[PDB]
Amino acid sequence: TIQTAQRCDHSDSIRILGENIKILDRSMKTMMETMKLMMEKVDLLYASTAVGTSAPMLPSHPAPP
Amino acid sequence: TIQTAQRCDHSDSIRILGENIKILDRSMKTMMETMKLMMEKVDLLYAST
Amino acid sequence: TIQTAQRCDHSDSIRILGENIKILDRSMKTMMETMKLMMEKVDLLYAST
Amino acid sequence: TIQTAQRCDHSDSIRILGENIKILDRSMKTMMETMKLMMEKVDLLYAST
Amino acid sequence: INRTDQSLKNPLLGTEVSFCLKSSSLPHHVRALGQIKARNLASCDYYLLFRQVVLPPEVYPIGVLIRAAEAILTVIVSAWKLDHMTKTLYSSVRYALTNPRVRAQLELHIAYQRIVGQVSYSREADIGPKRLGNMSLQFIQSLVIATIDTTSCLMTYNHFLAAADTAKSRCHLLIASVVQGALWEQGSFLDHIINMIDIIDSINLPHDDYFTIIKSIFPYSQGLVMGRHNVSVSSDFASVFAIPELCPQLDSLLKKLLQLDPVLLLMVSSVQKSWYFPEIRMVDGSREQLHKMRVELETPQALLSYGHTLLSIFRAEFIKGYVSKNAKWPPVHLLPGCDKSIKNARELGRWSPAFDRRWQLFEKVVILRIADLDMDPDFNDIVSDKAIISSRRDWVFEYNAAAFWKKYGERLERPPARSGPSRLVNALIDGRLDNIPALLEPFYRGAVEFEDRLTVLVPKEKELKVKGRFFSKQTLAIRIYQVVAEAALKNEVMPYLKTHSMTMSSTALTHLLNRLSHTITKGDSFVINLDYSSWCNGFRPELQAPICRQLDQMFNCGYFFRTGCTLPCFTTFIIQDRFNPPYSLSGEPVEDGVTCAVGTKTMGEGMRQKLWTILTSCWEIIALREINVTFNILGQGDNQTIIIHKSASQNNQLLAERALGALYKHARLAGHNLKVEECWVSDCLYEYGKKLFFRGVPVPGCLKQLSRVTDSTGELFPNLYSKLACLTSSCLSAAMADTSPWVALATGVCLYLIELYVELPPAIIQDESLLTTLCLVGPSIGGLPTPATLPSVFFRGMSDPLPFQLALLQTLIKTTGVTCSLVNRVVKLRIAPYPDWLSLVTDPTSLNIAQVYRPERQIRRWIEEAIATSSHSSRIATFFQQPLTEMAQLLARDLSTMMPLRPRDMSALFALSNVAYGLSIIDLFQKSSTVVSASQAVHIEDVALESVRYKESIIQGLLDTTEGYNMQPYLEGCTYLAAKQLRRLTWGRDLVGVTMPFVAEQFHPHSSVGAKAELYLDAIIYCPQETLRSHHLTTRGDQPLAANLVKDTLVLHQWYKVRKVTDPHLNTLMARFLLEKGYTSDQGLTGYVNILSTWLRFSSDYLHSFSKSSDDYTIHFQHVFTYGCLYADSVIRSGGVISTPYLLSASCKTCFEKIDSEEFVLACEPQYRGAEWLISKPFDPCVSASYCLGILIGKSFLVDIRASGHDIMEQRTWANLERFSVSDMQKLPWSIVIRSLWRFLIGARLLQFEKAGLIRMLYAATGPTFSFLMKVFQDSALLMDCAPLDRLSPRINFHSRGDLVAKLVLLPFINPGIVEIEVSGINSKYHAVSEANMDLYIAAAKSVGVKPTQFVEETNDFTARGHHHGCYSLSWSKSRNQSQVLKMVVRKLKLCVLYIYPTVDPAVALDLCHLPALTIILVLGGDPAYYERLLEMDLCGAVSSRVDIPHSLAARTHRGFAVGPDAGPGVIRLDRLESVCYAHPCLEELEFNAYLDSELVDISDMCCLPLATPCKALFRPIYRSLQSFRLALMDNYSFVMDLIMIRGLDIRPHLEEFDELLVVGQHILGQPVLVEVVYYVGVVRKRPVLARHPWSADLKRITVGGRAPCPSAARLRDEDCQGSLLVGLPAGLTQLLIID
Ligand SMILES: [Zn+2]
Ligand SMILES: [Zn+2]
């Protein structure tokens, strides 16, 4: 009875899971920024080559929620 | 006994991790969609080659 | 006792957590086969210049 | 009472997703190596124009 | 119709004329081409014709105008009671209208205006050959054909408008200049103006060079001024321009003006829009504009890198702002590699200074979501004055089909039907704006549809740039995007940025400016003016991409902002120049590089006006900080004023040079080539807010503002009323901003009379009396707007225009030869049949008259049918066509049921109403641009006929002689009562709440030369600190100078619950109001007179009648003080000098009405159901007030201690602690406030630094501090009734009331013995009382009760038969014997009245005052300084009770017995005896002999009178009881011991005070009193040390000299008392007392 509880407790494991999820979130943010840099470069290049022609303004973001 | 059960339940942590994984999935959809446009931005460049 | 005992149920949550993990991994594999698309496209671009 | 505790027992399931976290984490890492490489590829492309 | 303009409002364009001259096929062009003579000067040279127009002298009989202006000005001034000024004004205008040149200019202006009025808005096509002197103007549709002899000048109508506008501006300028010269230290500068006009008119250079000269005239004058009065930093700005090489005469004239007076030169040269305007060179201007838009000064990669740097600095500044505001870092993410310092700063939450110099560290920090973007703009700004187009399918509309056919050879295929709903309003009505976020989604996604990718470039009108200053008119979607982005940036970002916050805030900015105005003269804090000539055509996408991406991440509006930085790359730009259309290929314009451009780098002028400011501040800050110089930035956009403070390291010259170099370098990197031809460094001249300060004093704008003719007849068809209203608004604005009220008023009267002369027929014009009455009638009682009857001109705040109107009419009737019958037949009063409560709620002060002259607009009529047509219904278009007017009328009538009818509160209630918001929205939708122009354009015959209809109607109305309501009874007696009666009659319910009287009627000025006592019974006294003269008028003196509806409803709820009322109906109405919004649960004076005010001291001594009772009267102090200062200004400017103090006495008794402190009891249950469709989105106060006052004062002191000497001249307490009365404060039991302050201070427990600062400044007194404390603490009642003080009174020793208050308020840190006793009282809920509702508690405590009484404590008196008790007042003072001798002499002479001159010692006068059964008459000569000093010194009511103020202020020489003169009849004289030859029973040594009119007064038999409760002037704190002296001595000893522990505190001043008590104790003990004693003070082993012998090298030696035995100590020198003193005293204190 008494010993059957702590075995059912996994506070450390859940904390590790949460910390790993936070690491995932951090790396996701880093990817967001790197992708934003890529988008900046490509968008600016496309816009520069666009002036003087009728090239369509291709969307650069999926959609509002 | 009851106090032991309280430590055995981590709904609050479950809530935050569920929300975190959800927002991760949303970020993933955004990743895929944003990348999907680059092909349209580069394919014409290959044609220009 | 029974009212609070039922609240301890988390099987339904575990189901959606598993499905979330599966779909997230599927998105990961999709992005892998996506990036692999332009991998060679930009790798052979070394000879392009 | 014991059966109720067994019903709440999901450590094994947790263990499963725990390993997936590494497969998540490890997977996550590779992304950088396939994005940083293209990040600098674009950077040295934008400069040369 | 045609020629639908009466003022110049479009840029001149010669394209149409050139096209016509090329054999155009248009019939009217053919007609015009057949009339030009042989020599046809090009339209570019239109000014060359209109400069040669000369009318025969004296063509218009304007003599009646001169007489009328004279009479009107005389009446106005007399009504103001400044009669002595009349002459000046009464002459100046005459002179202005008699000078041949000015008269000729005025006649030319009249002829021009008549010509304009005979042609504009004409049904006819071509008007016959109108004559304008020697011209032969011949209009043809929108083309004019000027003709001076054998010289035609075929031009466009806009050219003629420009010429007429030039003539009007010149007339305004001449009249204003003459009037100003009259009222001006060095007057009559009209000659220079005329010479300048002739010189400029003599220029003969080509068009471009002429306009270059005209444009450069003003900057060149600035350069000349700077190059002559730059003390520190050299300037060469004047050398850039080429005026000296092109117009030598103009250069010489400017040099002469500079020699005379720089301010005069700056004023005269500021008139830019008074010389004929240029004809923009479209062919060479549009191409240059387009090329400049898409030029690249920097490679895009370098631009992107510098953009990243700008992003870094922006992040740093935003983080600093956010943490300074919310005391925590915003949600941020640190990329890998972030510096540990940033990590720690975020973890704790703070802003380490090192960041500001190390912004580069922030490149690794990204700000996460901080807010959200509100995709829902309010209609108020969405439809502001900015023309737009429906969509891309509209460009064909803005061109001429015939010209397009001629240019290419094919039709325009213009859609016959209107392809777009005209301007913003029509498109809005069509229902497009129903769903905003759905409309902005393409921006969010980043692909704006092709329909919204067109922008039209429109040249800017009324400018001197030959090549144009194109601005942008953009499609609807882009306009909405710009509005939303600008709102978001202005709300959720800009306030955080430090640089812009100090300019957004009204108060903060002012402080800064004041500081600068007080520093540039001193030789430090110079100024750099930067002028980015290519600001708008600058920014490229690369520079904006980083900050734009960061912003998009902030608001989580994906790519919403970023789209703006690349949109111009996909946009199509065309030039709005009819008769020059771009070619079309497939329904879209083609690119030619001259008229059309497919895609450019920059969005255009105005677009993203805010983000650009953010970036500009960013790179300027980067430029400056890298050289480490303190600075401030004030940016108006194109131009930036950078204040650079002095640095001891280098002189100002080197600092300025380095700053300029850095700014150039760091603005080049941002692709903004900053040519050094418009940026200059100065320390004497600087511009901000379009005001040009010279040496910190604003340069008068009279010449500029009065010469700046506005649009006139705006948003309506032409009519006399609109023109008069615009003129009146211009005059009021000129007076309010920066101008002499007299100059503005006189110029306004002259211009108003001229305008009437233009329109009205000779029947009315040639009638002097009728013209005068018509000009004085005013709009209030119903009449054409006028600049005369505007009390708001002289005064700043809210004004009641009715009583002033009646006062003016009374004065007119009484002075001029005009009878009441004429006023009746001119006013034509007619009470409305029924109350129109809507008008009252909209305008509380108005009457129920029928405003016959007011123009009835019909804009609602056009839009009412517009919504009906096409049945479009999704928005305001449909759910605002409900009977809103009827619902508003119902609500107003419902509000009318208030028993004590209060129109002010009525309007307040009818402000938090959904119906009120709807009415306001309708009004803005009507009275705005982009609607009248659109509505007028679609339907214009209506206005064409309406103009003539209105003109005929008004002429007929003015001509008829039938009288209206007999206004006789309201043109006599007090104007206040008359106004009340008139309001009651016209309304029928006796309005109470708005009748504040006419100050001039209320108060009559007078000079103290011969003022009688009665005049001083109720008066406000002004004292000039020296003789006043015109010089003082400029040199400063020394003396001190949406969602809101719900919160407003809640605030009003709290306010009305505080006032102790129970109105179920009002609660029901408020609940109904809140139901819709969804909450269904629960001194200062005016600008003109400040400088003169600084040399004057105000007061309030009429308390004898109107300030003793707590009841508040109708008086308005701001207005009264402004009026008095205006009187002084008038006396000065009329050639007089103000030497003696002068008063404003109370004249009209009935104009002082006790304010009705009543509450409204609204009777009928409200019937305003609601407007569900509107608004889509959702214990006694004394204790609380006392605790709030305590904490407020505590924090005020806490902020004052921080401020340095340079930051204390500002009187702005922490939060406006000053706007309080005196009685209100006296209501609160002061004990409570004192306990609260003590508790706050002890709880605060500040360390040594703050404690030392408090000690020093409180023993001193500066700023919103002990200064205002003493201000509040004149009344001695509070002191003796202040429970803390009475217990403390026997515990401390003082020397003046300025020291007792300091000891009382510093008790917490000096005497814990009693403060820790009173600290017992406490209540947690009282602590929670927030200060945001501070005023609520004061209002709740407004009528608590009655303030305490003053009592009259006695002084040691004497009698012939008395008992010598040995007590004597002023024992410590040297004048002790003198004061006692005077008292004995007075009692011996049995005087009932005594005169005291200011020469007598203040202490002696006070002691004489405390005598009973004696009347004191100070010979103050109108200066209450001496009496104020006596009141401050005393601590009882004797002075206030026994000093006759009305007689004292009215007495210049004594009448009877007096003291202070050395000789004279009845003068009391004291002759000091060389040797004391008599031992008076009361005075041991008689040191003086008393004489009266050369006769000695015997006082030998005099003896002491039985003493009783004595005043504090006897210094009871140290009483006969040595134990009291022991208490005081021990307390001071402990306080000094505590002070010694304060590091860095100058303890010497306290040590002298302590040594005084030590001397007293030594005298008591019998020890010798050493003249000098050396004390050694220091902290040894963490303990205080005060010893006369140096036993530690660290003790600071302090020497105290001048020690003398206090005679007051003689009484305490009892033999048995010596032992009791030393019993129990501290050992150190005993050692100090005992001299070795
Ligand atoms: Zn009166
Ligand atoms: Zn007293």
UniProtKB/Swiss-Prot annotation, chains B, C, D:
Subunit: Homomultimer; only active in its oligomeric state. Interacts with nucleoprotein/N. Interacts with matrix/M protein. Interacts with host TBK1. Interacts with polymerase L. Interacts with host HMGB1; this interaction is required to stabilize RNP on chromosomes.
Q: What does the protein in this record do?
A: Essential component of the RNA polymerase transcription and replication complex. Acts as a scaffold which brings L in close proximity to the N-RNA complex. Plays a role in the segregation of the viral genome in host daughter cells during mitosis by interacting with host HMGB1, a host chromatin-remodeling DNA architectural protein, thereby stabilizing RNP on chromosomes. Interacts with host TBK1 and thus interferes with activation of cellular antiviral state. Inhibits cellular histone acetyltransferase activities.
Q: What is this protein called?
A: Phosphoprotein
Give the lineage: Viruses, Riboviria, Orthornavirae, Negarnaviricota, Haploviricotina
| PTM annotation | Phosphorylated by host PKC epsilon and casein kinase II.
| Superkingdom, taxonomy of origin | Viruses
Q: What else is known?
A: The P/X gene has two overlapping open reading frames. One encodes the P protein and the other the X protein. The P (p24), X and P'(p16) proteins are produced by ribosomal leaky scanning.
Q: Where in the cell is it found?
A: Host nucleus; Host cytoplasm
Curated annotation (Swiss-Prot), chain E:
In Swiss-Prot or TrEMBL terms, this protein is called RNA-directed RNA polymerase L
In this protein, which residues make up the domain named RdRp catalytic?
524-696
Does the record bear S-adenosyl-L-methionine in its keywords? Answer: yes
Q: Where is this motif: Nuclear localization signal?
A: 825-833
Query: Highest taxon of the source?
Result: Viruses
UniProt subunit comment = Interacts with the P protein.
Record GO terms (molecular function): ATP binding; mRNA 5'-cap (guanine-N7-)-methyltransferase activity; RNA-directed RNA polymerase activity
Purpose of the protein = Displays RNA-directed RNA polymerase activity. The mRNA guanylyl transferase and mRNA (guanine-N(7)-)-methyltransferase activities are supposedly provided by cellular enzymes. The template is composed of the viral RNA tightly encapsidated by the nucleoprotein (N). Functions either as transcriptase or as replicase. The transcriptase synthesizes subsequently three subgenomic RNAs, assuring their capping and polyadenylation by a stuttering mechanism. In replicase mode, the polymerase replicates the whole viral genome without recognizing the transcriptional signals.
This protein's major location comes to virion
> Where does this one sit in the cell?
Virion; Host nucleus
Q: Could you tell me what reaction this enzyme catalyses? A: RNA(n) + a ribonucleoside 5'-triphosphate = RNA(n+1) + diphosphate
Write down the EC number. 2.7.7.48
Q: Which UniProt keywords apply?
A: ATP-binding, Host nucleus, mRNA capping, mRNA processing, Multifunctional enzyme, Nucleotide-binding, Nucleotidyltransferase, RNA-directed RNA polymerase, S-adenosyl-L-methionine, Transferase, Viral RNA replication, Virion
Q: Which GO terms describe its cellular component?
A: host cell nucleus; virion component
